From Swiss-Prot, chain A:
One of its GO terms (cellular component) is mitochondrial inner membrane. Its main location: mitochondrion. The gene is MRPS10. The chain holds residues 50 to 189 of 201 of the full protein. It comes from Homo sapiens. One of its GO terms (biological process) is mitochondrial translation. This is Small ribosomal subunit protein uS10m. It is found in: Mitochondrion.
From Swiss-Prot, chain B:
It comes from the Eukaryota. Abundant in testes, skeletal muscle and heart tissue. It is linked to Combined oxidative phosphorylation deficiency 51: An autosomal recessive, mitochondrial disorder characterized by intrauterine growth retardation, low birth weight, poor overall growth, progressive limb rigidity, delayed psychomotor development, hearing loss, and optic atrophy. Brain imaging shows abnormal bilateral signs at the basal ganglia and brainstem. Patient cells show decreased mitochondrial complex I and IV levels and activities, and generalized mitochondrial translation defects. PPR repeats lie at residues 23-56, 59-93, 101-135, 136-164. Component of the mitochondrial small ribosomal subunit (mt-SSU). Mature mammalian 55S mitochondrial ribosomes consist of a small (28S) and a large (39S) subunit. The 28S small subunit contains a 12S ribosomal RNA (12S mt-rRNA) and 30 different proteins. The 39S large subunit contains a 16S rRNA (16S mt-rRNA), a copy of mitochondrial valine transfer RNA (mt-tRNA(Val)), which plays an integral structural role, and 52 different proteins. Associated with the 12S mitochondrial rRNA (12S mt-rRNA). This is Small ribosomal subunit protein mS39. Belongs to the mitochondrion-specific ribosomal protein mS39 family. It is found in: Mitochondrion.
From Swiss-Prot, chain C:
This is Small ribosomal subunit protein mS39. It comes from Homo sapiens. PPR repeats lie at residues 94-128. Mitochondrial RNA-binding protein that has a role in mitochondrial translation. It is linked to Combined oxidative phosphorylation deficiency 51: An autosomal recessive, mitochondrial disorder characterized by intrauterine growth retardation, low birth weight, poor overall growth, progressive limb rigidity, delayed psychomotor development, hearing loss, and optic atrophy. Brain imaging shows abnormal bilateral signs at the basal ganglia and brainstem. Patient cells show decreased mitochondrial complex I and IV levels and activities, and generalized mitochondrial translation defects. The gene is PTCD3. Signal peptide: none annotated. It is found in: Mitochondrion.
Swiss-Prot record, chain G:
It comes from Homo sapiens (Human). The keyword Transferase does not apply. It is found in: Mitochondrion. This is Small ribosomal subunit protein mS35. The chain holds residues 53 to 243 of 323 of the full protein. The lineage of its organism: Eukaryota, Metazoa, Chordata, Craniata, Vertebrata. It comes from the Eukaryota. Keywords: Coiled coil, Mitochondrion, Ribonucleoprotein, Ribosomal protein, Transit peptide.
Length: 128, 164, 174, 33, 126, 56, 191, 123
């Protein structure tokens, strides 16, 4: 668009509620695919998005698995693990929505979230 | 027709005094009643920068009528103001059915070709066609006439290819 | 000191709306409703309208097949359930002569069937509630003695007879 | 089922339910070794 | 002929043998069912069979090549390659019809992505 | 197996919801049983869509 | 009709051409990319009609420009980590309990996964107010859930159908274990 | 030289199916064809056809608002049985099994218990 541009845009309504935010110590994202190049492209995408949102990310590659069965057929499952650390509940929600909506076909995700909680008041002292 | 203009203004002023907010249908009705015309400038100044929501079945008929006035009055600044209102927020949803969209854009582009400088005219031609509407024969005749008055005849083969 | 931030909340489509606001319109493409294939992009306004009506006709044929044979589409597999993708039922289920049968016929906007059921209710001497008669007259007056797809009001039509028969006519009926 | 369950209490590859589809690449992830 | 006297265009998918499926060819359908830990692989296979038969019977003599069935979340994308022999109006009719039937038959938002070609894209001759 | 350790085990069983009253190996089966829990459509759809002139 | 890549400028806004995940369109992608095993004295096939390029899960909708432009608009939705918690040393201090819960993203009509119920609670007993007797009692009650090397008690709950119910059960189990460890019985004196 | 909004006024004032159909007509004035893929996804999300992200595997499922203590402690429904017999042993085993069942709702567990109640009452 050279001249015809939207004069103003309706930004979505994000409300700062009163309730306190969840805190995640760690957030491990394990993505599984049949293709290593697809997982590498997804890793590049997710890592760049993490940097652009300020999240702290580390990437490693769990060993692959190969299921053979019987003429001999074979199925390779390759893994990529993206460990985010020290992100709140809202950052986690928005980042996960982004990277799950942009999950390529044939790739599955397992997100393990490690929430930080305080002791219940009921356990602070023994009952007398 | 003519006899009803002052009572229409009565109804509008009573509306605003009572705290009922006019919708696009109200201004459509006023514009069409007066078009049979400087009321459009006053209406547009009031509507500038506002966002609208559906309140009357006739709202979608506003912009078409408004653009018609700009076509009849041969005014480019008013047409740009109308299009800017159209592009404010989600106002574009009010253009109406495809027939109304084509009518609005055909009048708008005829006006751009007749009044705007050739480089900006070609920029608008690229922005609007085909992504917004499919132009009619009269529109390319007008664009060719614009190229004539601009003495930019070196572009004519491109317009011929596009018309094909 | 651990100051926990406050939870930001948004609607289920807010992220999509932000991402949509990121991108502008493509000037070299036809609208999103058409196919991007060169053979399938419309070249003219007439051709574009023809293509859109062709797609809509295909959709109507599909909906007709879906609603005509619900049994082949009743098997639900989606979790969460999608009421939007299930067949619609238009046939009156209640068959006995009762005010409830008339209510269902009114809700389904079956004008002729509603008037008929009212007539058998009369013949059975069953007193009809005023709200049911008002709903019947709303239906009749909106559609004017014709089934849902201008009509001219015909003297002594069903609406006039029903209105004249009402033992008590309130504001709403008038 | 539940009735029989309670009274008793008182007392080829099927993962896909194949050579055709697998050989024409119509089963995702399946390949020859 | 005589006993010792004895002693066809093909596209890419037809040309290459099954043992090239992860070497030269790819997989027509792409979904998570066959991955390790995932479930419902058989259900996806049955869905794929029905889609392929339905599409081959609903676009007869139009499909130039085999379908590509993608799945993302609950979306179901059919990327087909067709010929430029049928009229575009009938193509639009059939696209709408097939989309609606498959959406109401699989309770998911199915969507279809015709790509027309002038003629079969022959890779070699066998 | 000390009696003290026995009643430690039997208290832990109560806390985690396990069985307490003595379990015979042939009678641990009952716990496990309660622990765990269309060509017609295709064919008729195809033939009706054929008869309607929309399939094959 | 001619492909529309001929009308695409060399300095266009690519994200507007491919806003969302879409299949490869050879008439829309302005790249002379080729895919295919070439025949003898041949070349890899062109893109028009190529099924192999159509079978790739392409990333044209996620280019670096597009990713940065998306992540600049998504910053509005984010909050800030409390700067007091600089490292794990303070995360294990102010928030002793850790709750691990997992979600699974597959492709299909049903979003249900039976493995998403499990909840894992992890707490170091040294962060609980237990005396010597209470500590031995709690350790030998929990059994193998406690690892001596790490000083961590790990309670895994998956009995209930939902995840919130399993989280509540884990919290209930922890509370009951603490109270039963602090309680001293008449049979315990005979140790 | 003054705007149309200033001048004399009327001064007369100071400060069912019909409704549904008028609302459906008010809907029409903003019914435009979708403009790109994001509006496609947004409309599908509003209609409920798409999954809502981030993915929650327990979406649309609440288990009738039951709490854990309805699932884990099923012994209050054994109140009517023998209190100290072998039938009590078999019921304690049955309810221990049912309390470890994540695939059943509370109602189905209670129905199992009631079936056993009726059976043993008959016998």
């Amino acid at each position: 668009l050279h001249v015809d541009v939207p004069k103003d845009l309706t930004k979505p309504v994000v409300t700062i509620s009163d309730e306190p935010d969840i805190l995640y110590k760690r957030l491990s994202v394990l993505v599984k695919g049949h293709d290593k190049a697809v997982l590498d492209s997804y890793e590049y995408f997710a890592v760049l998005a993490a940097k652009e949102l300020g999240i702290s990310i580390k990437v490693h590659e769990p060993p692959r698995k190969i299921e053979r069965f019987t003429v001999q057929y074979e199925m390779r499952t390759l893994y990529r693990c993206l460990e985010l650390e020290h992100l709140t509940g809202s950052t986690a929600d928005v980042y996960l929505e982004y990277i799950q909506r942009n999950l390529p076909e044939g790739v599955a995700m397992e997100v393990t979230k490690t929430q930080l909680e305080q002791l219940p008041e009921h356990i602070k002292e023994p009952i007398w | 027709h003519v006899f009803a203009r002052s009572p229409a203004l009565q109804v509008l002023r009573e509306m605003k005094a009572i705290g009922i907010e006019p919708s696009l249908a109200t201004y459509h009705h006023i514009i069409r009643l007066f078009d049979q015309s400087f009321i459009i400038y006053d209406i547009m100044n009031e509507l500038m920068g506002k966002r609208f929501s559906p309140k009357d079945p006739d709202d979608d008929k506003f912009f078409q009528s408004a653009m018609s006035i700009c076509s009849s009055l041969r005014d480019l600044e008013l047409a740009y103001q109308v299009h800017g209102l159209l592009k404010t927020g989600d106002n574009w949803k009010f253009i109406g059915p495809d027939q109304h969209r084509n009518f609005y854009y055909s009048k708008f582009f005829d006006l751009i070709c007749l009044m705007e400088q050739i480089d900006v005219t070609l920029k608008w031609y690229e922005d609007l066609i085909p992504s917004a509407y499919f132009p009619h024969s009269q529109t390319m005749i007008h664009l060719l006439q614009a190229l004539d008055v601009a003495n930019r005849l070196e572009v004519i083969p491109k317009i011929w290819k596009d018309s094909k | 000191e651990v100051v926990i931030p406050k939870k930001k909340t948004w609607d289920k489509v807010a992220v999509l709306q932000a991402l949509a606001s990121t991108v502008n319109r493509d000037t070299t493409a036809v609208p999103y409703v058409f196919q991007d294939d060169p053979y399938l992009m419309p070249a003219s306004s007439l051709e574009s309208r023809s293509f859109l009506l062709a797609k809509k006709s295909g959709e109507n044929v599909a909906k007709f097949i879906i609603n005509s044979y619900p049994k082949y589409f009743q098997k639900d597999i989606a979790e969460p359930h999608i009421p939007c993708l299930m067949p619609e039922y238009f046939e009156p289920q209640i068959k006995d002569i009762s005010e409830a049968a008339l209510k269902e016929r009114i809700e389904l906007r079956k004008v002729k069937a509603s008037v008929d059921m009212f007539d058998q209710l009369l013949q059975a001497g069953t007193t009809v509630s005023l709200e049911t008669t008002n709903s019947l007259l709303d239906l009749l007056c909106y559609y004017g003695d014709q089934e849902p797809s201008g009509v001219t009001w015909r003297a002594k039509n069903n609406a006039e007879r029903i209105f004249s028969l009402m033992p008590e006519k309130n504001e709403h009926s008038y | 089922a539940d009735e029989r369950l309670r009274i008793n209490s008182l007392r080829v590859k099927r993962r896909w339910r194949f050579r055709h589809l697998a050989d024409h690449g119509q089963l995702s992830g399946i390949q020859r070794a | 002929r005589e006993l010792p006297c004895a002693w066809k265009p093909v596209t890419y998918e037809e040309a290459h043998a099954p043992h090239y499926i992860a070497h030269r060819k790819g997989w027509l359908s792409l979904h998570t069912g066959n991955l390790d830990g995932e479930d419902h692989a058989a259900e996806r296979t049955v869905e794929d069979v029905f889609l392929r038969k339905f599409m081959w019977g609903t676009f007869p003599g139009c499909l130039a090549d085999q379908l590509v069935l993608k799945r993302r979340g609950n979306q179901l994308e059919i990327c087909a390659v067709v010929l430029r022999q049928l009229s575009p109006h009938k193509y639009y009719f059939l696209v709408g019809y097939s989309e609606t039937l498959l959406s109401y038959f699989y309770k998911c938002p199915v969507r279809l992505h015709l790509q027309t070609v002038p003629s079969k894209v022959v890779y070699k001759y066998l | 197996l000390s009696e003290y350790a026995f009643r430690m085990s039997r208290l832990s069983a109560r806390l985690f919801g396990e069985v307490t009253r003595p379990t015979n190996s042939k009678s641990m089966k009952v716990v496990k049983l309660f622990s765990e829990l269309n060509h017609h459509t295709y064919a008729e759809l195809m033939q009706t869509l054929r008869f309607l002139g929309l399939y094959r | 009709l001619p492909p529309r890549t001929e009308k695409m400028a060399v300095d266009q806004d690519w994200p507007s051409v491919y806003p969302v995940a879409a299949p490869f369109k050879p008439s829309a992608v302005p790249l002379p990319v080729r895919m295919g095993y070439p025949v003898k004295k041949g070349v890899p096939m062109a893109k028009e009609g190529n099924l192999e390029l159509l079978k790739i899960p392409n990333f044209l909708h996620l280019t670096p420009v597009a990713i940065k432009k998306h992540c600049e608009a998504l910053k509005d939705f984010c909050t800030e980590w409390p700067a007091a918690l600089d490292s794990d040393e303070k995360c294990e201090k102010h928030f002793p309990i850790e709750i691990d819960s997992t979600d699974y993203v597959s492709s299909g009509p049903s979003v249900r996964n039976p493995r998403a119920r499990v909840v894992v609670l992890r707490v170091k007993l040294s962060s609980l107010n237990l005396d010597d007797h209470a500590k031995k009692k709690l350790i030998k009650l929990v059994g193998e859930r406690y690892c001596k090397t790490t000083d961590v008690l790990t309670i895994k709950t998956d009995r209930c159908p939902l995840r919130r119910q399993n989280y509540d059960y884990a919290v209930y189990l922890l509370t009951v274990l603490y109270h039963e460890s602090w309680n001293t019985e008449e049979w315990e004196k005979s140790k | 030289r003054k705007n149309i909004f200033t001048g004399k006024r009327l001064n007369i004032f100071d400060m069912s199916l019909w409704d549904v159909e008028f609302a459906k007509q008010l809907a029409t004035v903003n019914e435009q064809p979708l403009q790109n893929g994001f509006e496609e996804l947004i409309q599908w999300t509003k209609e409920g056809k798409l999954w809502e992200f981030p993915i929650n595997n327990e979406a649309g499922f609440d288990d009738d608002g039951s709490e854990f203590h309805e699932h884990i402690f099923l012994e209050k429904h054994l109140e009517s049985f023998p209190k100290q017999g072998p039938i009590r042993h078999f019921m304690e085993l049955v309810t221990c099994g049912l309390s470890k069942n994540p695939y059943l709702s509370v109602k189905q567990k209670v129905e199992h218990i009631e079936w056993f109640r009726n059976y043993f009452n008959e016998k």
